[PDB]
Amino acid sequence: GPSFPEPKVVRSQGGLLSLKLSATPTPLAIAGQRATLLTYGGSFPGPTLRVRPRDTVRLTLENRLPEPTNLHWHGLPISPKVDDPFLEIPPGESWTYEFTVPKELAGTFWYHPHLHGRVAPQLFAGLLGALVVESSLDAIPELREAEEHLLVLKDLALQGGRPAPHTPMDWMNGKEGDLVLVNGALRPTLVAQKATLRLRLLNASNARYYRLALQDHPLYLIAADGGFLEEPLEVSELLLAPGERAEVLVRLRKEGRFLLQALPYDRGAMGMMDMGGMAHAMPQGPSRPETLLYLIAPKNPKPLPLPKALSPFPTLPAPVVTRRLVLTEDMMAARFFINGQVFDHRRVDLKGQAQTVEVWEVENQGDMDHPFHLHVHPFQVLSVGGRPFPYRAWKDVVNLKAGEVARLLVPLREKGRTVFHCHIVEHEDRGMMGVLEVG
């Protein structure tokens, strides 16, 4: 096959993407070993769905798991009566998700389970795939002529040919695995044929962070989670927290082999030590460095010029309310709170008005990083930690280090009940989620 493995793509046909996917235990070969994973469509990752604005998506999910499941269309600003976080599909039953792709939308999204209390084991076991909304901006020559690849960043641990079970410490920290994979492959080689690469990046891990750096090269950020930036932004590295997406241009500077690495990053995970008094919690410290892939540049690379502009970011109306959402932890209990409470699907926590804009100040009073996700209503990050964000783009996950406040501008779009939660999915399963009702 191609040197660089990527999920099989399913494209809409005549404006319609109509697909049946089964969620099923499936034996496959991964990373050189045989294992049984839980997959969509028989593969890990699941198939990439590729659509255009105004397409209809009709996706029938057949549940062939031994427990209930559902889908979250992560990042899509659609109705929460479709992207329904409270729906349960029982074992053996099916449900059809049908929606229209919004007109003003572009970027890399993804789909995965969202059945409260069971997300972390289901996502860890292999249930996820990407959704790409292609744009008329993809026709500008500086993007059209780039070589495009999707990179699904997802780690795994195997025991006895199956995904390793969650331990109590995994529920506290979020589970990370020793197999650090790209598109389900272990350290694949990308032999570039063009000097400019357009890489769509997805962190579909439960909890692992990827502090991305390409040896000898900057990255040019052109899209965040939910849409394009206004112009490319040069960065020396790019941190992708669980659930985040980014698109970058890589301008290969000379022939050679360059490693794409996940550099050391300390997200605040904890271990336990006994040194005579004790036992007491102790920081794990930064992750060990990982090589994600080997990038081989072509001969005599001459990259395209960067695009001067991408998409202007919308002018938003003045906001009508400011909200404050404080994140705290009880690590030894593995319980996680928003404003002092754990999720309860019967309780509405915030009530807002469709088509108004809100300012959300989300404050991490814990010691771990927490990547905060809001369904249905993409947001503009204004500042995090008191530092203004250096670009304007739609996001739907924002990472908070210990102590930091993020200030978000949140236009409320579709009416209905939806949720916001930490995207360390173990923390969501363990309570760090609340309910927003938009009317």
CB atoms within 10 A of CB 198: 22
Q: In the β-sheet with 196-203, what is the strand arrangement from edge to edge?
A: 185-186, 179-182, 147-156, 196-203, 245-251, 219-223, 228-235
Q: Give which of a copy of itself, Cu ion, Na ion, none residue 22 binds (C-beta under 5 to 8 Å, depending on kind).
A: Na ion
Minimum CB distance to a copy of itself smaller for 91 or for 271:
271
Q: Which amino acid is at 361?
A: E
CB atoms within 10 A of CB 236: 9
Q: What is the binding site for a copy of itself (CB under 8 A)?
A: 169, 173, 176, 269, 271-276, 278, 282, 284
CB of 47 to Na ion, least distance (A): 11
H helices of 88-239, in order, are: 119-124, 141-144, 168-173
Q: Which amino acid is at 330?
A: D
Closest CA to 187 of 112, 42, 296: 296
Q: Give which of Cu ion, Na ion, a copy of itself, none residue 74 binds (C-beta under 5 to 8 Å, depending on kind).
A: Cu ion
CB of 273 to a copy of itself, least distance (A): 5
**Looking only at residues 230 through 249 of this chain, which bind Cu ion when binding is defined by CB under 5 A?**
243
Annotated ligand binding at 217? The verdict is no
Q: Give which of Cu ion, Na ion, a copy of itself, none residue 24 binds (C-beta under 5 to 8 Å, depending on kind).
A: Na ion
CB of 42 to Na ion, least distance (A): 4
CB of 278 to a copy of itself, least distance (A): 7
Minimum CB distance to Na ion smaller for 23 or for 419:
23
- The token pair that represents 247 in the structure block: 């698109």
Annotated ligand binding at 375? The verdict is yes
Q: Give which of Na ion, a copy of itself, Cu ion, none residue 276 binds (C-beta under 5 to 8 Å, depending on kind).
A: a copy of itself
CB of 181 to Na ion, least distance (A): 20
**Residue that the structure tokens 């969650």 belong to:** 166
**Among 422, 435, 436, 438, contact with Cu ion (rule: CB under 5 A):** 422
Query: How many Å is the Cα radius of gyration of the chain?
Result: 21
Cα–Cα–Cα angle for 75, 362, 377, rounded to 5 degrees: 25
Q: Give which of Na ion, a copy of itself, Cu ion, none residue 274 binds (C-beta under 5 to 8 Å, depending on kind).
A: a copy of itself
Q: How many Cα atoms within 13 Å fall on the side-chain side of residue 209?
A: 25
CB atoms within 10 A of CB 328: 16
Minimum CB distance to a copy of itself smaller for 176 or for 369:
176
**Among 5, 18, 19, 22, contact with Na ion (rule: CB under 5 A):** 22
Annotated ligand binding at 377? The verdict is no
Q: Helix, strand, or coil here: 130?
A: strand
Q: Distances from the Cα of 220 to the Cαs of 105, 308, 318, 415, in angstroms?
A: 21, 12, 31, 36
Taking the chain, what is the end-to-end CA distance rounded to the nearest angstrom?
Answer: 50
In DSSP terms, 179 is beta-bridged to 156
Residue 224 near Cu ion by CB under 5 A: no
Annotated ligand binding at 421? The verdict is yes
Judged by CB under 5 A, the stretch of 41-49, 264-272, 329-337, 380-388 that binds Na ion is: 41-49
Annotated ligand binding at 74? The verdict is yes
Judged by CB under 5 A, the stretch of 107-115, 127-135, 158-166, 410-418 that binds Cu ion is: 107-115
In angstroms, the CA 405 to CA 385 distance is 5
Closest CA to 85 of 416, 413, 408, 340: 416
Site string (342-381) toward Cu ion, x via CB under 5 A = ----------------------------x-----------
Q: Helix, strand, or coil here: 28?
A: strand
Annotated ligand binding at 373? The verdict is no
Binding interface with Cu ion (CB under 5 A): 72, 74, 114, 243, 370, 422, 424, 427
Which residues are annotated as part of the binding site for Cu(2+)? Answer: 74, 112, 114, 370, 375, 421-423, 427
Q: Which residues are annotated as a binding site?
A: 74, 112, 114, 370, 375, 421-423, 427
Applying CB under 5 A, the residues found at the interface with Na ion are 22, 24, 42
